[PDB]
């Protein structure tokens, strides 16, 4: 999630879980030729590939 | 003899304690409750702190004499 404070993690701590996410992605058509399996999204800056 | 390490490069002496601590039966008023430094309040004396859990990235070894494999006789390696 974005614009929220992530709880700090230390060794042996609980798993970080998010139940409601505010990340909204949008599928877009690539402007250039792409491989068949490749899919292009627009994601918020705070979002990682993981 | 000539000591190695000029006093400027060594850690400076901590500032002298405020005179409020020298008066018995007197509780100093410090900035420990404000959680930040201010010049017009006494400097609190913080007790030593322990992390409370084992962290490999921030581990500090015990003193050398406290190591289990410590012998008075030296071994040349």
């Amino acid at each position: 999630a974005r614009n929220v404070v992530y709880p700090l993690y230390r060794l042996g701590g609980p798993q970080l879980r998010v139940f409601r996410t505010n990340f909204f992605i949008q599928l877009v058509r690539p402007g250039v030729a792409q491989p068949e399996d490749t899919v292009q999204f627009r994601i918020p800056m705070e979002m990682t590939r993981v | 003899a000539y000591e190695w390490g000029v006093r400027s490069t060594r850690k400076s002496e901590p500032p002298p304690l405020d005179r409020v601590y020298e008066i018995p039966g007197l509780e100093p008023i410090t900035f420990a409750g404000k959680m930040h430094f201010v010049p017009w309040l006494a400097r609190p004396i913080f007790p030593p702190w322990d992390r409370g859990y084992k962290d490999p990235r921030f581990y500090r070894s015990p003193p050398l004499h406290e190591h289990p494999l410590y012998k008075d006789q030296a071994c040349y390696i």
């Binding site: 929220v4 609980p14 970080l16 998010v18 139940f19 996410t21 | -």
Partner: protein, 124 residues
């Protein structure tokens, strides 16, 4: 000749400046010796997605619905709906004491809880 009224981002500056500045994404690990990054599984936020099979509710609401007035939830309202019914039953029975408030649902301290209320240690 530099633009001082534009947003300072990771795309500006030399190589050391560009790699040190980010975009706001939270860190999910740390760097070890040899510039090797170690990703911590517990630092990666895991999505708790429920099963939506056989779910009645839908994104929109039909217009053929009454215009109910809005009643914001308050602490006093929640206490009466949840805790008050239990206390009344115990009050009539005659077994009531402040020592047993933990049994009614009261939490004297937030330590030792997976989801602490203040300060909260969970995401939205």
């Amino acid at each position: 000749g530099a633009d001082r009224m534009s947003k300072w981002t990771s795309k500006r500056g030399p190589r050391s400046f560009r790699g040190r500045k980010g975009r706001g994404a939270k860190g999910i690990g740390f760097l070890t010796s040899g510039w090797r990054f170690v990703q911590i599984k517990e630092m990666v936020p895991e999505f708790v997605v429920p099963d939506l099979t056989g779910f009645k509710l839908k994104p929109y609401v039909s217009y053929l619905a009454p215009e109910s007035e809005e009643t914001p939830l308050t602490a006093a309202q929640l206490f009466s709906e949840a805790v008050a019914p239990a206390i009344e039953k115990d009050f009539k029975d005659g077994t009531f004491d402040p020592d047993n408030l933990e049994k009614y649902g009261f939490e004297p301290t937030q330590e030792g809880k997976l989801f602490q209320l203040y300060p909260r240690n969970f995401l939205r």
